[PDB]
């Protein structure tokens with residue numbers, strides 16, 4: 001009943017605990033080892049006004065050079081697994097085969113994977129975590145063009161071929177919701193369209209459509225061409241946020257909350273469940289929502305071995321009072337129920353701590369989508385922004401420790417509920433490059449000293465994880 005007491009021994013023996021990262025956020029060596037640029041290099045370099053402090057991932061926290069140090073920290077941490085992504089423009093600088101296959105980039109991922117394995121840590125590997133190769137962006141518009149589908153398969157194939165003998169858990173995409181909405185609706189993430197210069201009412205829908213197609217076609221490639229020989233599993237990780245009706249007993253708000261789930265999570269989950277978009281998206285987006293061919297529907301339906309969910313926060317939802325994705329949802333998000341916020345702020349004013357949400361999002365996904373195997377692929381919280389603190393003060397992350405305890409507890413509740421969760425990955429292992437927010441937003445269980453070669457030092461939360469989840 002007390003969440004500070006939660007530990008490995010409240011979970012099945014085969015439950016996988018881990019931490020996470022993504023290539024652009026930690027690797028650095030952006031022009032080292034033959035890596036070609038991604039749309040994020042381009043965004044952060046051409047439009048440093050879009051980044052808090054105008055920073056980028058040229059060096060990030062230097063896991064490109066310090067990977068042996070991350071492996072040692074992961075080993076000391078004692079958790080089962082490490083979720084990281086492959087930088088598409090590292091292994092294929094030009095995005096397609098014709099831009100050349102980068103042997104040194106492959107060698108880096110082999111070294112990381114080998115390091116992880118020699119230390120009993122399972123690699124969980126995401127192919128696409130937003131770093132679309134600039135060459136593809138430039139040649140045809142990246143995910144705006146169906147040409148992205150074939151190129152992504154050839155990339156997935158290269159990765160299965162090179163790494164599949166040792167990597168047994170693959171995700172095609174991480175958070176295409178976030179990628180689609182902030183790249184193409186709000187224009188706040190790479191490639192920064194939407195705020196032809198963009199169109200927030202059409203482009204997010206093509207992007208998501210192509211993302212879904214890319215995902216389906218790479219899953220089919222894995223299933224048909226690698227799975228028998230390699231015996232791994234492939235899925236995808238989705239952005240989630242719990243949507244609670246503003247008024248418990250208002251039919252309108254219950255529908256509004258369900259529509260909000262529909263536009264965020266249903267948007268990707270229904271295609272991979274029934275091969276179509278949610279009814280409410282069809283109704284509210286009309287002719288601006290693309291149709292799948294029957295062949296695409298066959299390919300999308302059931303196209304995963306597992307689904308990863310990413311969870312941070314929650315919101316109340318109510319009905320709303322030219323065209324844009326944001327206005328299509330026809331909802332208004334509310335944070336406060338009569339001056340009572342759904343939960344307290346973290347270091348970020350958008351992250352309201354509501355641990356129960358992770359439980360309701362799990363329960364909701366099993367019910368609505370009937371996913372057989374679920375991983376929490378991301379869950380975590382950011383430190384209050386404060387450059388005044390010494391490391392000993394900074395590393396006492398009480399709020400994170402409680403946040404993890406409380407969420408992990410709720411994951412356990414979801415599993416009692418019937419949700420088959422097979423592991424849980426904290427976001428993140430390292431303080432890292434937090435997209436539009438730069439370095440000031442620290443999600444790590446390992447503190448990074450940005451004044452000193454990105455020195456790693458475990459925060460209280462890492463110590464507790466080691467001691468409680470070995």
Ligand SMILES: OC[C@H]1O[C@@H](O)[C@H](O)[C@@H](O)[C@@H]1O
Nearest residue numbers: 022174175178310378427434
């Ligand atoms: O916002 C915190 C984190 O959110 C997750 O959805 C993304 O996958 C990470 O790349 C990001 O750093």
